[PDB]
Design a protein around this ligand. Sequence first.
Ligand SMILES: Cc1cc2nc3c(=O)[nH]c(=O)nc-3n(C[C@H](O)[C@H](O)[C@H](O)COP(=O)(O)OP(=O)(O)OC[C@H]3O[C@@H](n4cnc5c(N)ncnc54)[C@H](O)[C@@H]3O)c2cc1C
Ligand SMILES: [Mg+2]
Ligand SMILES: [Mg+2]
Ligand SMILES: [Mg+2]
Ligand SMILES: [Mg+2]
Ligand code: NA
Ligand code: NA
Ligand code: NA
Ligand code: NA
Ligand code: NA
Ligand code: NA
Ligand code: NA
Ligand code: NA
Ligand code: NA
Ligand code: NA
Ligand code: NA
Ligand code: NA
Ligand code: NA
Ligand code: NA
Ligand code: NA
Ligand code: NA
Ligand code: NA
Ligand code: NA
Ligand code: NA
Ligand code: NA
Ligand code: NA
Ligand code: NA
Ligand code: NA
Ligand code: NA
Length: 256
Amino acid sequence: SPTRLTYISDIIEISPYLRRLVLSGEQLANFPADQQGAYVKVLIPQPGETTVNMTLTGPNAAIKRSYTIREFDPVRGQLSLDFVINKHTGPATDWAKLANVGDTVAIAGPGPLKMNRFDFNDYLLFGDSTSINAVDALIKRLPATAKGHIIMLVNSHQEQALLSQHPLLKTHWLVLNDSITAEQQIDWLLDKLELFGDLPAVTQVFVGLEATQVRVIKQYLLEQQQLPLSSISATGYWKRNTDADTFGKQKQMQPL
Ligand SMILES: Cc1cc2nc3c(=O)[nH]c(=O)nc-3n(C[C@H](O)[C@H](O)[C@H](O)COP(=O)(O)OP(=O)(O)OC[C@H]3O[C@@H](n4cnc5c(N)ncnc54)[C@H](O)[C@@H]3O)c2cc1C
Ligand SMILES: [Mg+2]
Ligand SMILES: [Mg+2]
Ligand SMILES: [Mg+2]
Ligand SMILES: [Mg+2]
Ligand code: NA
Ligand code: NA
Ligand code: NA
Ligand code: NA
Ligand code: NA
Ligand code: NA
Ligand code: NA
Ligand code: NA
Ligand code: NA
Ligand code: NA
Ligand code: NA
Ligand code: NA
Ligand code: NA
Ligand code: NA
Ligand code: NA
Ligand code: NA
Ligand code: NA
Ligand code: NA
Ligand code: NA
Ligand code: NA
Ligand code: NA
Ligand code: NA
Ligand code: NA
Ligand code: NA
């Protein structure tokens, strides 16, 4: 896929921890129209710089980070991405918090879609503010008859509106704050799992969460609920105390 030069045409705060950037430009005119919930790699300039180049490796290559397509309107040729802000420090979140309309942004991708099948009727969808737009994309493709649960960790009640309604899927939300420890988050996730009891054997599961959360949920599903591996689409979106490049190489060595 060709790297594309885009322009920020709008910025909107969605919550105190989530900033939507709307990208525009003639380079998006032929962007693929079927990739909601897929990710792109955003090139991030060095702090206090604005330019990036096409160098692949070494000290002059741009930092790259993965962000989910919230919306691509082909009539309008505009791409929306929702960046978590004010929860951590790193090149992309820092850059996103300070970005302005008219700034240019180079993007690559989209990357290969890793997502569940849309044709079943039993689902658990686990996500957080980093994966919420992948969860939304999946919900909007499921049959109206699909039963199950949506289980989300968000940084603000305001983020809940990002998920499509669905007639039957039941939502469960935990709004995070600094008093809720990593262990308590895992306890909450496992508490929800146990509350679902014996899962239908045909249940399909999406997980897009922090790396250890993914490990715990996946192991529970495989060993306690005995779901087939093929029924789980699990991705570690981020990992505590680990930058994206380090994390990427960890996942290459040992996939989740
Ligand atoms: C397919 C895919 C799609 C993604 N889509 C989105 C998206 O749409 N929106 C989004 O915000 N993120 C998304 N992410 C996650 C995003 O790529 C990471 O959060 C990334 O680490 C952010 O880059 P950074 O440069 O800000 O921080 P990094 O330099 O990668 O990390 C620096 C520090 O920040 C920690 N950290 C990173 N992210 C978080 C976080 N959200 N919360 C708390 N601590 C964090 C790290 O553990 C590390 O210690 C996606 C990831 C994947 C794999
Ligand atoms: Mg353009
Ligand atoms: Mg993030
Ligand atoms: Mg942040
Ligand atoms: Mg969709
Ligand atoms: Na909002
Ligand atoms: Na808003
Ligand atoms: Na957020
Ligand atoms: Na243009
Ligand atoms: Na993708
Ligand atoms: Na730069
Ligand atoms: Na560069
Ligand atoms: Na190149
Ligand atoms: Na070079
Ligand atoms: Na995604
Ligand atoms: Na997004
Ligand atoms: Na997001
Ligand atoms: Na920030
Ligand atoms: Na971010
Ligand atoms: Na599936
Ligand atoms: Na998202
Ligand atoms: Na649907
Ligand atoms: Na569909
Ligand atoms: Na609903
Ligand atoms: Na903890
Ligand atoms: Na999480
Ligand atoms: Na199993
Ligand atoms: Na299966
Ligand atoms: Na399957």
